[PDB]
Design a binder for this molecule. Structure first.
Ligand SMILES: CC(=O)Nc1cccc(N(C(=O)c2ccc(Cl)cc2)[C@H](C(=O)NC2CCCCC2)C2CCCCC2)c1
Lengths: 10, 227
């Protein structure tokens, strides 16, 4: 979830 | 008959973010230059998978109403649709974006990446079935959006919020089918047939990943840890 959360909240 | 001003607006917002997508030159140059070993061919497919994830997220963020959804449901939608969106984008790249020589080289690389035929054959079968439909850019962009905004994915808390986003996309796709193919009343049904065929790739994909757990060459922690 860390990678998806980063790309989504960028 | 025509799309209402609101449907034209909705389709325009979907077309705009979809057209921004581009397969980078460095990946294209690798398909042409790198060694034909199973390790190098697999490394090219790893680069394509990581690129797809980045492209998918940027596209999804610009989908009308997506950013109005609860943050956890936004994650759940991206997680549940990533595999189906990959096959849809891959179909378009193979059948429209890559030149005949480049795609023949990519297929050679895929067929020699150390991946079993069981996970290669349904993939090329799907590319042929999709190519037979002679799909427009509008149909590719709408189908991709419909796949991402699926209200039946696991771990979504507010499914009704997602239904309100997907229903107007389905109305738009059916209206475009009635406008551009009036002599073929079954054209919309053919597009829904691709949605059901896409869903079968989730179990094929999960089976493929589960088998790499005892392999040192194919195991990619970045993608495996999520999917
Ligand atoms: C059944 C099946 O998936 N077959 C099958 C065959 C060949 C390459 C692939 N993959 C592709 O990315 C791919 C690449 C190019 C094409 Cl034209 C088609 C597909 C793998 C994949 O499933 N990636 C997913 C992306 C979205 C997030 C979950 C991971 C990838 C996993 C990591 C190591 C390299 C290979 C998949």
């Amino acid at each position: 979830h860390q990678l998806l959360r980063y790309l989504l909240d960028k | 008959m025509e799309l209402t001003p609101d449907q034209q607006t909705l389709l325009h917002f979907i077309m705009d973010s979809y057209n921004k997508q581009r397969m980078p030159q460095e990946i294209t140059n690798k398909i042409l230059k790198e060694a034909f070993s199973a390790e190098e061919n697999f490394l090219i497919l790893t680069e394509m998978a990581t690129n797809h994830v980045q492209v998918l997220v940027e596209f999804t963020k610009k989908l009308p109403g997506f950013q109005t959804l609860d943050h956890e449901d936004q994650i759940a939608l991206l997680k549940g649709s990533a595999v189906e969106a990959m096959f849809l984008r891959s179909a378009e790249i193979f059948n429209k974006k890559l030149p005949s020589g480049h795609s023949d080289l990519l297929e050679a690389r895929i067929r020699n990446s150390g991946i079993s035929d069981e996970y290669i054959t349904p993939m090329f079968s799907f590319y042929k079935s999709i190519g037979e439909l002679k799909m427009t850019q509008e149909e590719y962009a709408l189908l991709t959006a419909i796949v991402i905004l699926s209200p039946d994915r696991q771990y979504i808390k507010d499914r009704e919020a997602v239904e309100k986003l997907q229903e107007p996309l389905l109305d738009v796709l059916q209206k475009l089918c009635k406008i551009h193919q009036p002599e073929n009343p079954q054209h919309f049904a053919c597009l829904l047939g691709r949605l059901t065929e896409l869903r079968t790739f989730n179990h094929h994909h999960a089976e493929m990943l589960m088998s790499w757990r005892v392999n040192d060459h194919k195991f990619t922690p970045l993608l495996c840890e999520i999917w």
